[PDB]
Paper text:
Thus, we expressed, purified and crystallized the TMD of Rh-PDE (Rh-PDE–TMD, residues 33–316). The structure was determined at 2.6 Å resolution by molecular replacement, using the structure of bacteriorhodopsin (BR, PDB ID: 1M0M22). The crystallographic asymmetric unit contained two molecules (mol A and mol B). In the Rh-PDE–TMD structure, the two protomers in the asymmetric unit form a dimer. The interfacial interactions occur in the intracellular halves of TM1 and TM7 of each molecule, whereas two monoolein molecules fill the dimer interface at the extracellular half. TM0 exists on the exterior of the rhodopsin domain, and is located between TM2 and TM3. Trp63 in TM0 hydrogen bonds with Ser136 in TM2, and the other residues form extensive hydrophobic interactions with TM2 and TM3. Lys296 at TM7 forms a covalent bond with a retinal-Schiff base (RSB) of all-trans retinal (ATR), as in the other microbial rhodopsins. In the Rh-PDE structure, Asp292 directly hydrogen bonds with the RSB, and the protonated Glu164 directly hydrogen bonds with Asp292. Moreover, there is no water molecule around the counterion in the current structure.
Enzyme rhodopsins comprise the N-terminal rhodopsin domain and C-terminal enzyme domain, connected by a linker, and function as light-activated enzymes. Rh-PDE derived from Salpingoeca rosetta (SrRh-PDE) was first identified and exhibits light-dependent hydrolytic activity for both of cAMP and cGMP, whereas it lacks pump or channel activity. SrRh-PDE consists of the long N-terminal region, transmembrane domain (TMD), including the rhodopsin domain, C-terminal PDE domain, and 76-residue linker region connecting the TMD and PDE domain. Here, we present crystal structures of SrRh-PDE–TMD with and without the linker region, at 3.5 and 2.6 Å resolutions, respectively.
Numbering used by the authors:
A (entry chain A): 49 to 310
B (entry chain B): 47 to 310
Amino acid sequence: TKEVQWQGIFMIIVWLCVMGSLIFFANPEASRRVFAKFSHLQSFYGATSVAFAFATGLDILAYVNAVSDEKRVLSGILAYVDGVACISYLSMATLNLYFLVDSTQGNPVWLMRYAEWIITCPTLLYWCGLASRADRSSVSDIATADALLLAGGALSSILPSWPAFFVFAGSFATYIYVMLHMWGMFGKAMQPDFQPPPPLPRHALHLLRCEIVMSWSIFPLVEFLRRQGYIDFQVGEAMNCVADYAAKVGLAMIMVNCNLEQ
Amino acid sequence: ASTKEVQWQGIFMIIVWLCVMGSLIFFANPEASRRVFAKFSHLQSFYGATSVAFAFATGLDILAYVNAVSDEKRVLSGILAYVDGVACISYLSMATLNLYFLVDSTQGNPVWLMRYAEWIITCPTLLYWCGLASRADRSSVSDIATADALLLAGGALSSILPSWPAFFVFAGSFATYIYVMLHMWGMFGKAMQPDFQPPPPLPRHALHLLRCEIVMSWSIFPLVEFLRRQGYIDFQVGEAMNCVADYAAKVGLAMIMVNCNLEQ
Ligand SMILES: CCCCCCCC/C=C\CCCCCCCC(=O)OC[C@H](O)CO
Ligand SMILES: CCCCCCCC/C=C\CCCCCCCC(=O)OC[C@H](O)CO
Ligand SMILES: CCCCCCCC/C=C\CCCCCCCC(=O)OC[C@H](O)CO
Ligand SMILES: CCCCCCCC/C=C\CCCCCCCC(=O)OC[C@H](O)CO
Ligand SMILES: CCCCCCCC/C=C\CCCCCCCC(=O)OC[C@H](O)CO
Ligand SMILES: CCCCCCCC/C=C\CCCCCCCC(=O)OC[C@H](O)CO
Ligand SMILES: CCCCCCCC/C=C\CCCCCCCC(=O)OC[C@H](O)CO
Ligand SMILES: CCCCCCCC/C=C\CCCCCCCC(=O)OC[C@H](O)CO
Ligand SMILES: *C/C=C(C)/C=C/C=C(C)/C=C/C1=C(C)CCCC1(C)C
Ligand SMILES: *C/C=C(C)/C=C/C=C(C)/C=C/C1=C(C)CCCC1(C)C
């Protein structure tokens, strides 16, 4: 608990800069045609945005109400992640943002979603570290792999077939490395001997590592199925919105319960 | 116990819902709903999205029930679980099934009897919940729950009458909604007093945030209906505001009581 606030502030500045450049480099005629070919996309982003707004509301009430200083700090990090997600989705619904066209279908690659993911996923992993009192170097290395992972995802969408294949597969492979080590550090902390004691009970550490595996796995699955031609773009965008929301509010639902218990 | 009673209320809610959903399926015109969803392409997304939101809202209420700081906390978090669940499946239904609907006199826009059905099962139940929070007289709670139910039916009926009977039934509805909000505001007030016995299960500040939440959120429905019937917003813009309002009205109550549990 040494100003999560500072982490949240750095998050916001990186976001605004990226949002800045996405506005300045946008092609508005291009975005008009994307939203005209795909008429459900504004609704999806709009709806997701409102959802995270209310999600951020709930996290604020968890912060202002320190049942513990341990559980003040953890509710603070979720407030920023959910807020970042809120405004990124508002942006996607309302503004003309620069985007890539993918090699496989010529579908749009939303750099704002990838930007959100790169600011928030490594922060969610750092949050996993506080919950489990993990080694700071072990947390750092997964936060890094996660960031490289996501960039891999984005890059892979604009390469030809074989370099596309390799970068996606390497990405996917790092995602396994990440989920395994995340699973590990929650496990180290579930042990009866473990010092220092974790700020959450044994059961809640387990529900958290299960939540991350179930929710986060949907993104690689959507990307695989859409790139191959098995779902269309809009069906994938829907699953992504539900997944994004699920991944984040899932963590705030499980810690609301910890407060109620203690 | 009172937990058994909340369960029983929830069960009656589910049976009334299924019957109404039943008849809406049996009497649907599928060619009609295909044309409605073809003229208005955002409607499935709105209902779908709202549905997922209430599902997660119902998730949060379950964790509040299993984890009740006190038994009154269990009773109050239990009632919100059923209301949010009812809302969840009503919206899933609207997105996925062909449901019988009315065409309104003013625009020939669809009147979703499933939304009205949800409202009639849940709004009177939310008012009864306001009673437990404020330890109000049972007859005062009953009379607002009744007026609220008649109110909503008034809303629905008014959409399929000609101009002057339409006008009177809507205005009488609107008028009862004022009567309801005033008396709701009252019973929370009686309970905020320092002398009040028996002590309310929520602190003074939270009783105030609740009566403010209901007034802000619930007032959006009559406003959407007024503005759409007159031609100032189109149908889809109104449906969006309704979805956001419905969700807001309900999860607003669960956000404020999550805080009461945290406070000790
Ligand atoms: C360079 C210093 C200038 C000082 C001001 C700060 C802003 C700088 C940042 C981005 C400028 C974007 C310029 C790139 C070219 C225009 C992008 C654009 O208009 O998109 C049009 C579309 O692609 C076809 O019509
Ligand atoms: C928190 C509950 C879940 C979230 C809310 C569920 C209801 C969705 C309604 C509005 C979303 C925000 C407004 C977005 C409305 C659609 C945007 C729009 O209408 O765009 C024009 C269209 O793309 C041209 O064909
Ligand atoms: C639409 C409005 C509805 C409300 C939802 C907001 C929308 C999200 C906005 C920004 C993201 C960053 C928000 C970060 C919140 C951090 C909360 C916190 O920890 O604040 C501490 C204290 O109250 C003060 O110093
Ligand atoms: C905890 C459980 C974790 C398990 C994982 C959950 C499910 C992952 C779903 C899909 C991964 C697909 C990866 C397969 C390798 C990629 C094939 C491919 O990339 O297709 C070529 C295309 O050109 C683009 O480059
Ligand atoms: C095929 C690839 C799919 C990827 C699947 C990723 C999900 C990880 C699941 C299990 C890892 C099991 C081995 C990790 C061992 C550490 C955890 C442990 O021992 O559990 C804690 C114990 O209960 C406290 O006392
Ligand atoms: C998570 C997805 C939800 C999807 C939507 C489906 C409809 C849900 C309706 C009710 C939910 C459960 C209500 C919680 C039960 C509390 C009452 C209780 O269990 O106590 C009574 C006691 O057991 C006496 O026998
Ligand atoms: C469009 C035209 C419609 C007209 C406008 C809306 C009408 C307001 C409705 C109810 C107010 C309820 C009043 C407060 C509750 C009853 C007061 C009461 O009976 O108590 C005795 C008191 O001392 C004596 O004022
Ligand atoms: C579309 C427009 C919708 C119209 C919505 C109107 C809502 C009325 C709410 C409050 C009025 C307050 C005055 C009437 C009753 C006062 C009770 C009270 O405030 O009591 C608190 C205090 O503790 C005493 O000691
Ligand atoms: C808050 C948002 C979260 C947790 C988002 C998670 C995203 C992923 C784990 C994405 C994984 C991907 C791969 C492993 C390879 C293909 C591309 C990605 C980025 C979808
Ligand atoms: C859980 C959902 C809620 C709180 C729904 C509430 C609905 C209303 C308060 C509707 C009010 C109306 C009027 C006062 C006049 C016109 C008809 C209505 C039904 C739109």
